């Protein structure tokens, strides 16, 4: 009797899309997952009493041809847009990831969470305020995560599911 | 997953919080009715729970209405969780 939620993880190479996704699926930090590999996962999880099946695509890029990525981008219900708090370029790229989602969904109001990953690091270049301001301007929630420590991982995915519910 | 709570967990919380506030010894049996009303705002995923539950009071099964308020709020990149028993009264 599971409610299916189709989720897509997007963001620049190296931000931690694979590490975040694998923390949710396998409950440990996998710190060297091939940066070119895309894979989907089916996670059975109870969220707020709802038995959910999260159908999650971990994307590896948006340029190389992928029938599977195109299908998930077109029919995906919610998107994690991930940058790294020590990588200003990854944060500047967020605009382009959001624009692609709005274009393929033909909607201004797509369920999304802005995720500032690697919040374990001392080497912050993107201030929490800077990220929160961008998210607020988009009308999307913002959370800081560490795939390394698993900080914020469950809350990022649960927040995306709650964003999809608001919109369904 | 600390802010992902089931109706039963919120009913046990209500009984435990009542027992603490009023120095009572109600023993939770089961939930009879539940209404959950979600309240959404920017970075707010809040819920009012209207619970009818059965608890043993001095060896006698009685019905109670409880209201539990749950706040799940993102502030400066961090999830903030809050739960409070708002009301607990016999039916
Ligand atoms: N310090 C730190 N490093 C991370 C974190 N998440 C991922 N990494 C590292 O960042 C690099 C890229 O992670 P990966 O998950 O492959 O990124 P992807 O290209 O977005 O899939 C790897 O060296 C990971 O070990 C994190 O939360 N903290
Ligand atoms: Mg990857």
Author numbering:
A (entry chain A): 0 to 167
B (entry chain C): 2 to 92
Mind quoting what the paper says about this structure?
The RAS family of small GTPases consists of four members, KRAS4A, KRAS4B, HRAS, and NRAS, which act as bi-directional molecular switches that cycle between an inactive GDP-bound form, and an active GTP-bound form. RAS mutations are the most common oncogenic drivers across human cancers, but there remains a paucity of clinically-validated pharmacological inhibitors of RAS, as druggable pockets have proven difficult to identify. Here, we identify two RAS-binding Affimer proteins, K3 and K6, that inhibit nucleotide exchange and downstream signaling pathways with distinct isoform and mutant profiles. Here, we demonstrate the use of Affimer proteins, a scaffold-based biologic, to identify and directly probe two druggable pockets on wild-type KRAS associated with inhibition of nucleotide exchange and effector molecule binding.
Three of the Affimers, K3, K6, and K37, showed clear inhibition of this process, the remaining four Affimers that bound to KRAS showed partial (Affimers K19 and K68) or no inhibition (Affimers K69 and K91) of nucleotide exchange. The latter four Affimers are not discussed further, besides K69 which was used as a control in the Nano-BRET assays.
